[PDB]
Design an enzyme around this catalytic site. Structure first.
Site, PDB file in Angstrom:
ATOM      1  N   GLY A   1     -16.115  42.054  69.813  1.00 37.46           N
ATOM      2  CA  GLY A   1     -15.636  41.077  69.201  1.00 37.46           C
ATOM      3  C   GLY A   1     -14.974  40.369  69.392  1.00 37.46           C
ATOM      4  O   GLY A   1     -14.694  39.476  68.411  1.00 37.46           O
TER       5      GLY A   1
ATOM      6  N   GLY B   1     -11.247  38.104  68.195  1.00 36.40           N
ATOM      7  CA  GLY B   1     -10.969  37.097  68.601  1.00 36.40           C
ATOM      8  C   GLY B   1     -11.908  35.967  67.567  1.00 36.40           C
ATOM      9  O   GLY B   1     -11.161  35.292  67.255  1.00 36.40           O
TER      10      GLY B   1
ATOM     11  N   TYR C   1     -15.298  37.679  65.721  1.00 39.92           N
ATOM     12  CA  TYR C   1     -15.023  38.771  64.832  1.00 39.92           C
ATOM     13  C   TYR C   1     -13.797  39.499  64.195  1.00 39.92           C
ATOM     14  O   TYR C   1     -12.757  39.962  64.602  1.00 39.92           O
ATOM     15  CB  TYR C   1     -16.261  39.299  65.138  1.00 39.92           C
ATOM     16  CG  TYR C   1     -17.565  38.894  64.906  1.00 39.92           C
ATOM     17  CD1 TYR C   1     -17.743  38.597  67.084  1.00 39.92           C
ATOM     18  CD2 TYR C   1     -18.821  38.546  64.623  1.00 39.92           C
ATOM     19  CE1 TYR C   1     -18.937  37.733  67.147  1.00 39.92           C
ATOM     20  CE2 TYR C   1     -19.317  37.901  64.792  1.00 39.92           C
ATOM     21  CZ  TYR C   1     -20.026  37.361  65.814  1.00 39.92           C
ATOM     22  OH  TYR C   1     -20.893  36.409  66.689  1.00 39.92           O
ATOM     23  N   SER C   2     -14.055  39.185  62.559  1.00 39.83           N
ATOM     24  CA  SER C   2     -12.973  40.202  61.806  1.00 39.83           C
ATOM     25  C   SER C   2     -13.263  41.090  61.828  1.00 39.83           C
ATOM     26  O   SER C   2     -14.192  41.447  61.524  1.00 39.83           O
ATOM     27  CB  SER C   2     -12.493  39.124  60.420  1.00 39.83           C
ATOM     28  OG  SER C   2     -11.115  39.510  60.229  1.00 39.83           O
ATOM     29  N   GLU C   3     -12.927  42.456  62.152  1.00 40.55           N
ATOM     30  CA  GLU C   3     -12.158  43.689  61.867  1.00 40.55           C
ATOM     31  C   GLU C   3     -13.918  44.339  62.044  1.00 40.55           C
ATOM     32  O   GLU C   3     -14.488  45.319  60.740  1.00 40.55           O
ATOM     33  CB  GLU C   3     -12.300  44.229  60.053  1.00 40.55           C
ATOM     34  CG  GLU C   3     -10.440  42.906  59.696  1.00 40.55           C
ATOM     35  CD  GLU C   3      -9.659  43.218  60.193  1.00 40.55           C
ATOM     36  OE1 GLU C   3      -9.732  44.751  60.644  1.00 40.55           O
ATOM     37  OE2 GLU C   3      -8.914  42.418  60.420  1.00 40.55           O
ATOM     38  N   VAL C   4     -14.053  44.461  63.019  1.00 37.99           N
ATOM     39  CA  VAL C   4     -15.787  44.869  63.358  1.00 37.99           C
ATOM     40  C   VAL C   4     -15.467  45.925  64.468  1.00 37.99           C
ATOM     41  O   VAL C   4     -14.926  45.477  65.563  1.00 37.99           O
ATOM     42  CB  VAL C   4     -16.700  43.568  64.125  1.00 37.99           C
ATOM     43  CG1 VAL C   4     -17.832  44.597  64.626  1.00 37.99           C
ATOM     44  CG2 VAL C   4     -16.823  42.609  62.758  1.00 37.99           C
TER      45      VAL C   4
ATOM     46  N   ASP D   1     -25.125  30.904  54.849  1.00 42.67           N
ATOM     47  CA  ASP D   1     -24.531  30.667  56.165  1.00 42.67           C
ATOM     48  C   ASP D   1     -24.938  30.541  57.696  1.00 42.67           C
ATOM     49  O   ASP D   1     -24.627  31.702  58.245  1.00 42.67           O
ATOM     50  CB  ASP D   1     -23.483  31.765  55.672  1.00 42.67           C
ATOM     51  CG  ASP D   1     -21.954  31.571  56.550  1.00 42.67           C
ATOM     52  OD1 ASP D   1     -22.274  30.486  57.386  1.00 42.67           O
ATOM     53  OD2 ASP D   1     -21.367  32.108  57.024  1.00 42.67           O
TER      54      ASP D   1
HETATM   55  O1  7FC Z   1     -21.067  42.303  58.487  1.00 37.52           O
HETATM   56  C1  7FC Z   1     -22.109  42.028  59.640  1.00 37.52           C
HETATM   57  O2  7FC Z   1     -22.920  41.381  58.471  1.00 37.52           O
HETATM   58  C2  7FC Z   1     -21.750  42.187  60.595  1.00 37.52           C
HETATM   59  C3  7FC Z   1     -23.111  43.448  61.028  1.00 37.52           C
HETATM   60  C4  7FC Z   1     -23.313  43.758  61.855  1.00 37.52           C
HETATM   61  C5  7FC Z   1     -22.368  43.100  63.192  1.00 37.52           C
HETATM   62  C6  7FC Z   1     -22.401  43.883  65.077  1.00 37.52           C
HETATM   63  O3  7FC Z   1     -21.563  43.043  65.317  1.00 37.52           O
HETATM   64  C7  7FC Z   1     -21.107  43.299  66.628  1.00 37.52           C
HETATM   65  C8  7FC Z   1     -20.407  42.434  67.441  1.00 37.52           C
HETATM   66 CL1  7FC Z   1     -19.658  41.597  66.458  1.00 37.52          CL
HETATM   67  C9  7FC Z   1     -20.367  42.640  69.080  1.00 37.52           C
HETATM   68  C10 7FC Z   1     -21.058  43.876  69.112  1.00 37.52           C
HETATM   69 CL2  7FC Z   1     -21.200  43.852  71.801  1.00 37.52          CL
HETATM   70  C11 7FC Z   1     -21.903  44.675  68.848  1.00 37.52           C
HETATM   71  C12 7FC Z   1     -22.284  44.331  67.581  1.00 37.52           C
HETATM   72  C13 7FC Z   1     -23.187  45.185  66.484  1.00 37.52           C
HETATM   73  O4  7FC Z   1     -24.441  46.419  66.877  1.00 37.52           O
HETATM   74  C14 7FC Z   1     -23.484  44.692  65.147  1.00 37.52           C
HETATM   75  O5  7FC Z   1     -23.912  45.435  64.210  1.00 37.52           O
HETATM   76  C15 7FC Z   1     -20.876  42.554  62.925  1.00 37.52           C
HETATM   77  C16 7FC Z   1     -20.612  42.472  61.552  1.00 37.52           C
HETATM   78 CL    CL Z   2     -16.055  37.758  61.201  1.00 37.61          CL
END
Ligand code: 7FC
Ligand code: CL
Ligand code: CL
Ligand code: CL
Ligand code: CL
Ligand code: CL
EC number: 2.7.11.1
Length: 331
Positions: free
Chosen positions: A44, A46, A48-51, A154
């Site tokens: 993700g 752009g 999502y942060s630090e995923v 949220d």
């Molecule tokens: O901090 C959090 O609560 C949290 C929890 C889960 C995720 C999470 O993100 C994903 C993203 Cl962005 C892309 C894709 Cl392709 C798969 C996933 C995924 O499997 C996944 O578990 C992100 C943040």
């Molecule tokens: Cl985020």
């Protein structure tokens, strides 16, 4: 002063639990080994942060690593305790491990790996039945965490991941979640502006689970009316004005007088006087195949000023808007 308020359902769930269930400050976080995981790529990017996608080398399994931004130790332990308490719940993201960098001491959460077709690609191509189905899946997650004494605080499309292939859904990003305790005053700087309930915009601190039901109403309105976001405020004051331009100011002032909410003086002139606009006013041609009489009635019972008048997650799941969705999932 302000009149006290209590949740209609799940009021004493935490009181009946042992103290260690909700006393997250006394909880001792047992951190895992960071070397057990190797990062593969960003996810993700752009939005999502630090995923990161990662590999658990101790079992050759795919996981997701979320590196947390520097916040207080209290908020770290709160999120971890909430994720562990909700682990195994329906449509709740599963926390797999807790790791920390050796030298920089940066916390990181490890989650299960699922697919994510973000709303920006599905908002344009969601069917009427698909809207009902995913709304119901979100309600199952909300009813569970509320029944476990947790407010998400949220709820928004960014915090809902949908696996369109498997018809799966996960509620994520529990960093703003809190435990509900009767009589406790909570921070009003929660959720995003477009999804903030009126209790946050008038600074009423004694809110409860029903805050999540307002946010859900905002998501539903944006989907069936094809208006993202539905309440598009430019600041905190303008957010309540745009809500007042739809629900009317008559019920807003009754809400203010019901709980003796001392509204700020200049803000009263900001709101002014607005009539209530019926929900059929936001329907036209392209968004027509998504609006039904039961959809408007359900939306009307979520977008209520009075947080105690909004449907609970269980009452929402039994609304006729989901009648066929319920019977089809039972097969
Ligand atoms: O901090 C959090 O609560 C949290 C929890 C889960 C995720 C999470 O993100 C994903 C993203 Cl962005 C892309 C894709 Cl392709 C798969 C996933 C995924 O499997 C996944 O578990 C992100 C943040
Ligand atoms: Cl985020
Ligand atoms: Cl969002
Ligand atoms: Cl709080
Ligand atoms: Cl608006
Ligand atoms: Cl509820």
């Amino acid at each position: 002063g302000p009149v006290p308020s209590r949740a209609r359902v799940y009021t004493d769930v935490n009181t009946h639990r042992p103290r260690e269930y909700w006393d997250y400050e006394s909880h001792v976080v047992e951190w895992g080994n960071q070397d057990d995981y190797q990062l593969v790529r960003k996810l993700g990017r752009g939005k999502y942060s630090e995923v990161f996608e990662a590999i658990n080398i101790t079992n050759n399994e795919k996981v997701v690593v979320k590196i947390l931004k520097p916040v207080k130790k209290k908020k770290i332990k709160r999120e971890i305790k909430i994720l562990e308490n909700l682990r195994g719940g329906p449509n709740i993201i599963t926390l797999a491990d807790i790791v920390k960098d050796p030298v920089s001491r940066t916390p990181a959460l490890v989650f299960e790996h699922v697919n994510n077709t973000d709303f920006k690609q599905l908002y344009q191509t969601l069917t009427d039945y698909d809207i009902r189905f995913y709304m119901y899946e979100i309600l199952k997650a909300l009813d569970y965490c509320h029944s476990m004494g947790i407010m998400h605080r949220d709820v928004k499309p960014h915090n809902v991941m949908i696996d369109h292939e498997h018809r799966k859904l996960r509620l994520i990003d529990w960093g703003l979640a809190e435990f509900y305790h009767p009589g406790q005053e909570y921070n009003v700087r929660v959720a995003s502006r477009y999804f903030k309930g009126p209790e946050l915009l008038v600074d009423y601190q004694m809110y409860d689970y029903s805050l999540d039901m307002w946010s859900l109403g905002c998501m539903l309105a944006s989907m069936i009316f094809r208006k993202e976001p539905f309440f598009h405020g430019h600041d905190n004051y303008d957010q309540l004005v745009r809500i007042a331009k739809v629900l009317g100011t008559e019920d807003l002032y009754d809400y203010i007088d019901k709980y003796n909410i001392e509204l700020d003086p200049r803000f009263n002139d900001i709101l002014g006087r607005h009539s209530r606009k019926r929900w059929e006013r936001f329907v036209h041609s392209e968004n027509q195949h998504l609006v039904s009489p039961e959809a408007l009635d359900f939306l009307d019972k979520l977008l209520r000023y009075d947080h105690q008048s909004r449907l609970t997650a269980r009452e929402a799941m039994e609304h006729p808007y989901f009648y066929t969705v319920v019977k089809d999932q039972a097969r």
